[PDB]
Design a protein around this ligand. Structure first.
Ligand code: M2P
Ligand code: M2P
Ligand code: M2P
Ligand code: M2P
Lengths: 358, 366, 358, 366
């Protein structure tokens, strides 16, 4: 009957994101999915730092936070295990001992500079009490473009989901997925590879099966949102929680079990094109983080994507203690850091050996 | 088989927003939906004021903008036709000649103080070129609660939809609907009655049927998004465009036709509980804005909601001309305003008489 | 940059159903929304007749069912209170005393003939145990077209929702809404005004508030599905449950409360264009059905749509008892029927007086 | 603030279909995903046999149809290439030359019996003219459980999408996806592994890119519908079209381009858990079907799922011609058939040699 000439971009099937950065996004994804390597999450907020300087009793100052990063970044040879570093806004503008800004320092060593672009958690104000959303989309492109000029080529945004009474509200499931999807699009348009982090928190008395159920439910909606917004699959990365029992459940899971549940959930929700999955440690111990990732890279279940790490706590705990916040502790701190980095590097390769942590 | 104890608030059917401000939001809606009254939209941005100040060749200063606003906010007797005023952020802080801030000034005169809370249009960056989204959800509650303290009781947020090639992208239909829905929730939680404004623009060569189809499509997704975010229907208002032919279509619709198409489109998409629809003028001439509203209020079609106006251009055009800027044309300015406000007050009641309106009115489209 | 010529019907905003029957569908709606009139639901299945015939000692035969329908359809005077009658597939082909098929007989006497087109409830096989879906869409156009030929001008389809533990599953909320919307579209395309019936059953121990919550949640999705399918709003009717406490709640609700909750729920979910809402009695007594409808038509809440009845049990109970299935009880049964039809007629007008029912 | 005890099955996150047939379903997938083996699509309807017997002039009779399928089913040694066969309704009840039903015959021969359970295409009656939906969900569990009792362990259901003007309507995209997902669920509940077939037809002037876009769009929705209905991913299979230019586009794609586009589209839409993808020949020639599958199994792109075949035409065409419907032609026919079977078997392994195959294969598109 009646025909009409429309713009191809107005047709539902042609919603895939169009950006001149596509080629570079794929290249960054390539470097970020290097065998035997993972990411160092060093984007702790000024408030989280206070928590970090505790078992070592160090004051929370701008200078000490810079030394906190310098401890791990200026550690000779770390680029052997780390392919990218998620920096905090403050650290982006700080300089290493050699005078290079941290992004320049990383870029010179072949390490991709990354940046946490979200603006923190806030009450969801919908759904159930205790649920939270993430702010930061207003003025996003402006901020991202500036970070890109400073050398950053990838970013990270975190949304959280709190399991309560074995479930999570649909308000949270829908809203946080839309937030993550929009974030992915604005990032790619700004030239930064987006690390989409939908963390189903370990907090709670739930068992591994509950975590498995909620994680699958939360993750598949993130995927649906991403398809709605037309993300470039070849140009993004996922940063999920591992499927493990709750922190206050009193139950433990064998590495084989975590790998089974974690890998099964991912495969059941993620498109096979997803380039990589960089696990957050989120509450697991340094050894758990390594053992689990290792068992995950030994799973017989389908996992076409790169499975590695994007650890903060699981790579810093020991390094911080041995360092003690003192110069004389750098050598020991750096030794502690590289060891954890090496263990996780081998875990990525499925050759982790627990005896090495004995 | 297995049973589990969950919070009622975690179940899909219990997503309705819970706020202690509910009673107050409803009360405000009542005032905002008073027979024979509409809203004055004086929320033009600082930049937009440069577009209002061109014809009269006025200096775009903070003092002048205050006069621009005071020109009509102080015009005695206007509260007989205006039940609420949408103020710009800067005007909320300015004072009237009496020393009271406009919010305080308006309240004492019975006129509810409102505030435009959105942060402007930006490129959608999804869908088709030319489409735009609206920012402002970050730190919203913090801004809204502050406005509340200053006396504001309702807010306004505007999203736009550009008809191109007889259609709009779904990226735009979905995203702007979600933005508007979230906006409504945060406003109600902050104590401000939200005026949801999904404007399908008159820009383009599209005819009235194309505007009808697009408006229906856009509006229903806004309603769907509102249902998912659980808005309190009894406490919000809609500010839509009227369904009319495009500005460059070469055609002009008769009042009866615009009434039919507009009232029909609202009925097919809006829940019967929606307390009120406050039309934007969107480029129509001052007379058309009055003529069409009057016809709308004489439509035999279903319309349980209060139908009125929330005009900016269709209420300030001539009153601005007569004013010119000097306090000399103040009487002439406040005279042209009260007349336009009276014509629309009559329209709300469906008693508008074209014979009482100037026999000459040019489009306010740009 | 790139344009494409497509069919206007391929665009999302142009999904409204196109049918040459539109004008007739609206004309039918007008007759079914006539002040002081309602619908008689006489579409009981063979199995339901058993439940109606058992308590009066009447054998369930093809002949006794016809006599069961004749009892009401030939109660001269009922046309004054009944604008339409929902017939069972069997009755459509039966004949009244004068040799006319019931549809012909009804049409000749000013009543619009309708037909129940759904094929029964079945286990949902998704969501929670006890939930059911409704079959009937396969070959629907063929059946509906045959009905139109015989004189039917509107139809009815029933889906049910069972409140369990104060909630219902999304699987049911979504699936049944999609079933109803598809059914509405196919009915209109066939020239039959569709009566959409999403019955939130009174069964259970829930209070009126829970019914309100579930009814609003169920209603809204039915509407959403109708919008996605592009139904002609000016050509359909809703046949919902009134909002009242559960049948096993041991709680009673005053007429004014039912009216407030019911009218408020419709207003919050139904587009103002919906032409009419014909309530099902669903377990309420004959008196509650009249009392509640009467209060609904006296409610100060918004209600652009016509509010009337589409009752089965609430119009048949007393009549079946007085009739006793005996030709010698016809006069008594018909007086009871007319009385009940009369009470609901005055209820539609908001002039029902409880004293009239003693 | 208040709590409530509900069934776990009432919560959104717990919607995975639960069936006692899960184990057997997965076991069945394992059989249907055996390296070097594919499926034989012999579910042609009586009306579809009319056009297949047209060439060799064979009367469409229950008997002639029985032999037509026996030709391939009783082809000695075909089990080395075929893991399962999709039968038509009547063939399920017909008998092999040894007196036992084909299902019993195939089972004893290590082959899995399958049944096509859809009731055919019908006008969509929504969206655009030319679009079709598929009927068959009414009384499904009853029919399916009947087939299961007769030996069947998997089924097939086909929905089609027609590219027109470079696109398809959302009405079709949504409705056909929901139909497939409900079909999948009812199938698993009846103990049958469902092969979900969303065919974006090769018909049209469109190029490979338009087919890619449309296929991506259509398939992701099927996936969305499957997640909403809670399908058991570990127990189902997908049967899509390959991404190739239209039959009337005038262009023909090189094996490796088809591989790139097809695999890329699958990876962007399908969850990594999806057991396998059994392609349809959809009109391609016998050799094209084999070449493309070979190139597909040689793609460097991510593809965790078993990629194989489930052809009807591309496997029967020449074998049928050789048979001629004559008894003396059974040998000639079964050689051609077992040949094509071997070719696709190699293609499944990415070890297909174009040399070892015919030199000229005509289009099977009508
Ligand atoms: O609360 P803040 O100051 O905003 O910091 C958050 C930041 O540490 C996290 O987003 C990590 O990047 C990520 O969750 C992996 O960390 P682990 O879960 O492996 O410890
Ligand atoms: O361009 P800005 O600075 O964002 O301000 C726009 C604002 O004045 C309008 O949106 C009114 O609130 C309303 O929509 C009526 O406008 P008219 O359509 O009646 O002119
Ligand atoms: O279960 P069946 O044998 O198919 O028949 C059901 C049928 O009587 C009802 O669906 C009515 O059409 C309507 O719902 C009003 O019924 P009441 O609730 O007013 O009695
Ligand atoms: O006309 P009907 O009765 O609906 O039967 C069609 C049926 O043979 C096909 O759909 C196959 O099951 C499969 O899709 C492979 O088809 P091709 O490989 O020949 O393209």
């Amino acid at each position: 009957m009646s025909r009409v000439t429309v713009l191809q971009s107005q047709l539902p099937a042609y919603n895939r994101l169009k950006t001149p950065y596509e080629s570079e996004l794929i290249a960054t994804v390539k470097k970020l999915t290097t065998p035997g390597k993972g990411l160092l999450a060093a984007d702790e907020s000024i408030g989280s730092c206070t928590k970090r300087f505790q078992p070592i009793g160090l004051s929370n100052t701008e200078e000490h936070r810079r030394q906190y990063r310098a401890l791990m970044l200026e550690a000779e040879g770390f680029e052997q295990y780390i392919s990218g570093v998620i920096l905090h806004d403050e650290t982006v503008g700080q300089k290493a001992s050699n005078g290079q800004t941290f992004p320049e320092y990383l870029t010179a060593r072949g390490v991709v500079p990354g940046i946490k672009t979200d603006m923190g958690l806030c009450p969801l104000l919908e759904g159930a009490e205790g649920e939270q959303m993430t702010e930061g989309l207003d003025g996003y492109v402006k901020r991202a473009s500036a970070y890109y000029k400073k050398g950053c080529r990838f970013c990270k945004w975190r949304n959280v989901y709190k399991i309560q009474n074995g479930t999570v509200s649909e308000s949270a499931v829908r809203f946080n997925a839309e937030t993550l999807a929009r974030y992915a699009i604005l990032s790619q348009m700004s030239g930064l590879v987006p690390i989409v982090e939908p963390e189903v928190m370990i907090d709670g008395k739930h068992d591994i099966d509950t975590c498995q159920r909620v994680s699958e439910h939360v993750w598949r909606e993130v995927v649906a949102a991403l398809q709605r917004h037309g993300v470039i699959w070849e140009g993004c990365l996922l940063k999920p929680n591992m499927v493990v029992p709750g922190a206050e459940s009193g139950k433990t899971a064998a590495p084989e079990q975590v790998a089974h549940y974690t890998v099964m959930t991912l495969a059941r929700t993620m498109p096979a094109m997803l380039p990589g999955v960089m696990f957050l440690s989120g509450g697991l111990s340094e050894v758990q983080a390594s053992e689990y990732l290792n068992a995950i890279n030994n799973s017989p279940l389908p996992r076409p994507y790169f499975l590695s790490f994007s650890y903060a706590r699981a790579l810093q705990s020991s390094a911080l203690k041995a360092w003690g916040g003192k110069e004389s502790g750098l050598a020991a701190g750096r030794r502690a850091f590289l060891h954890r980095a090496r263990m996780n590097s081998m875990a990525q390769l499925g050759k982790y050996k627990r005896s090495d942590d004995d």
